[PDB]
Design an enzyme around this catalytic site. Structure first.
Site, PDB file in Angstrom:
ATOM      1  N   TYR A 199      10.081   2.853   1.802  1.00 58.83           N
ATOM      2  CA  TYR A 199      10.948   1.722   2.115  1.00 58.83           C
ATOM      3  C   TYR A 199      12.411   1.885   1.688  1.00 58.83           C
ATOM      4  O   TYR A 199      13.205   0.937   1.786  1.00 58.83           O
ATOM      5  CB  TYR A 199      10.364   0.454   1.510  1.00 58.83           C
ATOM      6  CG  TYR A 199       8.998   0.088   2.052  1.00 58.83           C
ATOM      7  CD1 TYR A 199       8.860  -0.587   3.267  1.00 58.83           C
ATOM      8  CD2 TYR A 199       7.844   0.436   1.357  1.00 58.83           C
ATOM      9  CE1 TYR A 199       7.604  -0.903   3.770  1.00 58.83           C
ATOM     10  CE2 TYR A 199       6.592   0.123   1.849  1.00 58.83           C
ATOM     11  CZ  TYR A 199       6.475  -0.541   3.054  1.00 58.83           C
ATOM     12  OH  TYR A 199       5.217  -0.815   3.537  1.00 58.83           O
ATOM     13  N   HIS A 255       9.436   3.888   6.739  1.00 61.65           N
ATOM     14  CA  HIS A 255       9.292   2.477   7.085  1.00 61.65           C
ATOM     15  C   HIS A 255      10.640   1.808   7.286  1.00 61.65           C
ATOM     16  O   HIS A 255      10.753   0.811   8.000  1.00 61.65           O
ATOM     17  CB  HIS A 255       8.503   1.712   6.016  1.00 61.65           C
ATOM     18  CG  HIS A 255       7.028   1.950   6.073  1.00 61.65           C
ATOM     19  ND1 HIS A 255       6.347   2.107   7.260  1.00 61.65           N
ATOM     20  CD2 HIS A 255       6.103   2.073   5.091  1.00 61.65           C
ATOM     21  CE1 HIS A 255       5.068   2.323   7.005  1.00 61.65           C
ATOM     22  NE2 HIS A 255       4.892   2.307   5.698  1.00 61.65           N
ATOM     23  N   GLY A 269       0.860  -1.168   0.000  1.00 60.20           N
ATOM     24  CA  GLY A 269       0.000   0.000   0.000  1.00 60.20           C
ATOM     25  C   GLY A 269       0.899   1.220   0.000  1.00 60.20           C
ATOM     26  O   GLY A 269       0.591   2.248  -0.615  1.00 60.20           O
TER      27      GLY A 269
END
Ligand SMILES: Cc1cc2nc3c(=O)[nH]c(=O)nc-3n(C[C@H](O)[C@H](O)[C@H](O)COP(=O)(O)OP(=O)(O)OC[C@H]3O[C@@H](n4cnc5c(N)ncnc54)[C@H](O)[C@@H]3O)c2cc1C
Ligand SMILES: Cc1cc2nc3c(=O)[nH]c(=O)nc-3n(C[C@H](O)[C@H](O)[C@H](O)COP(=O)(O)OP(=O)(O)OC[C@H]3O[C@@H](n4cnc5c(N)ncnc54)[C@H](O)[C@@H]3O)c2cc1C
Ligand SMILES: CC1=C(C)C(=O)C(C)=C(C)C1=O
Ligand SMILES: CC1=C(C)C(=O)C(C)=C(C)C1=O
EC number: 1.6.5.2
Lengths: 273, 273
Positions: free
Chosen positions: A155, A161, A149
């Protein structure tokens, strides 16, 4: 080479992109001459909970139940739950194994987590005596095709994240490579929910094009087991010689074996050049 | 401080050490005056598979079912499956949450993975606009009490499995902290199957002694969300000032935010000194 492939899908909706990704892989692979078998965990209404019900028969120690030992014996004597044996039968036949699933809580869906726990029984999928590169599935190759998502920037090394290579590690090394699997580069499709109708189309197209020569791809790098004293004595630690030769290297060997130094770029996302 | 505690256990055997470790915590915390509530997933025969059945009623979009949005709506409108809601009520009440479980496939048991997937519903556990340190659970503390078959040396930087701090990252940062939780140091008890009866007894005692002052503990370090531009446009990337100031740091901020440098020792196992 490989001609037999298994696609394990972990998604309940036939309208999802994950399902679309599964249909595109089966169609692509088929066209190239492969035999494609599937495991739509949801559609099979697969049981993800390991319990003493996975052993159809007498336990060696019913009063003190220990899943590992009993499950290994059940596999050895042929007392494994029929649905488990069915999946194992698929794995023994597969040359290539695809895990199509949406990232959930920085990992695989519980139904897929449970599929590993119940199907990857000791002796069958692994053996301390034949860990990692020496495992049962060393002749096989696995690929994770994940959708997320969150955007890719979340990332990246400075994304909130955190590095995706760390997320992929416990699965690709801990589960896949632990059993001998050669793990190919993960097919990562970020923020699939924020992707234009036309791009989504190319995404399926790109995945199919990739599968045309997937068997000839270079697998991700994992420290070879040879660098370790695979005995309980030495405490499965990295050989002294090897530890010394490495003391002079700038980077660590991988994500898990970063050794306190820098981790090789995209160690779990890209294969060495 | 803390008066109420929730202990989530993920093990089927009432004869396991995990259960023993769960009884130990209950007893110790109770003795210190805490109220102890439990979630024995197996005993509760908890359902770990997310489905459109987690929504008791009409879906906004049945034809193209997307779990995230539908479950957030169901939460907002009060249509979440009763079993989910009861766990959410346990979370809202607890100050301290203990996750007692055996390490399985370098992660949490699927029944527990499913528990996070069904219980940690958007708006309830997250906020996106309130991620991590700004999450809904910021006033609560989580702790993982794990048991493993493999010895601690297997998880050391030189151990064949690789650094344990990477294994815990996706769980402690991706699951707990992402939701706002302050994560205390993991209670790690390795190769519990190769531990003398006398030692096992000490392990239980050590666990209890720690819980005596667990709320006063210094939680693990996670890069503050203040170091990032928490919006779409910026891609939730680390602020330029922050990036530059960090360029001159020997070590990365954490396991996920290693930034390409050395990872702080035991980032996910030990709190800063
Ligand atoms: C419990 C849970 C935990 C989660 N945890 C995380 C997490 O940790 N990190 C994170 O980043 N995300 C997370 N997510 C979000 C999740 O990863 C995404 O919702 C999911 O990957 C979206 O893809 P999908 O295939 O499931 O379905 P869909 O949302 O349906 O999206 C597929 C899209 O492609 C379209 N489409 C479908 N078929 C086709 C086709 N054949 N051709 C072209 N277009 C097509 C659809 O209309 C739709 O817009 C979580 C979700 C859940 C439910
Ligand atoms: C599917 C699966 C995957 C796994 N993956 C991994 C992995 O990735 N990495 C890894 O390292 N391990 C792994 N394991 C091993 C697992 O972590 C261990 O088997 C488990 O942690 C052992 O602890 P236990 O409490 O479950 O049970 P038990 O094996 O029963 O052991 C507890 C021991 O303590 C004794 N005991 C019980 N109660 C008490 C008490 N009150 N006081 C004193 N002694 C007591 C028991 O007699 C026994 O000897 C896996 C296991 C399974 C089934
Ligand atoms: C994954 C995700 C993204 C990236 C968003 O932008 C929004 C709006 C939601 C709800 C969401 O859950
Ligand atoms: C399902 C889901 C939940 C519950 C969230 O909290 C966030 C932020 C994302 C991306 C997501 O996709």
């Amino acid at each position: 080479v490989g001609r037999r492939a298994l696609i394990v899908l972990a998604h309940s909706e036939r309208t999802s992109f994950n399902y679309a990704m599964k249909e595109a892989a089966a169609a692509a692979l088929k066209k190239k001459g492969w035999e494609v078998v599937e495991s739509d965990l949801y559609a099979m209404n697969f049981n993800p909970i390991i319990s003493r019900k996975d052993i159809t028969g007498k336990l060696k120690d019913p009063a003190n139940f220990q899943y590992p030992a009993e499950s290994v014996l059940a596999y050895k004597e042929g007392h494994l739950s029929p649905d488990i044996v069915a999946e194992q039968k698929k794995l023994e036949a597969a040359d290539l194994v695809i895990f199509q699933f949406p990232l959930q809580w920085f990992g695989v869906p519980a139904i897929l987590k449970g599929w590993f726990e119940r199907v990857f029984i000791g002796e069958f999928a692994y053996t301390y005596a034949a860990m990692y590169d020496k495992g049962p599935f060393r002749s096989k190759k696995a690929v994770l095709s994940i959708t997320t998502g969150g955007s890719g920037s979340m990332y990246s090394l400075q994304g909130i994240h955190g590095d995706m290579n760390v997320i992929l590690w416990p699965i690709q090394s801990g589960i896949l490579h632990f059993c001998g699997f050669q793990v190919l580069e993960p097919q990562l499709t970020y923020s699939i929910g924020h992707t234009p109708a036309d791009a989504r189309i190319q995404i399926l197209e790109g995945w199919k094009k990739r599968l045309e020569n997937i068997w000839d791809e270079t697998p991700l790098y994992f420290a070879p087991s040879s660098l370790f004293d695979l005995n309980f004595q030495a405490g499965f630690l990295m050989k002294k010689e090897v530890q010394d030769e490495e003391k002079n290297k700038k980077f660590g060997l991988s994500v898990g074996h970063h050794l306190g130094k820098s981790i090789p770029t995209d160690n779990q996302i890209k294969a060495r050049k």
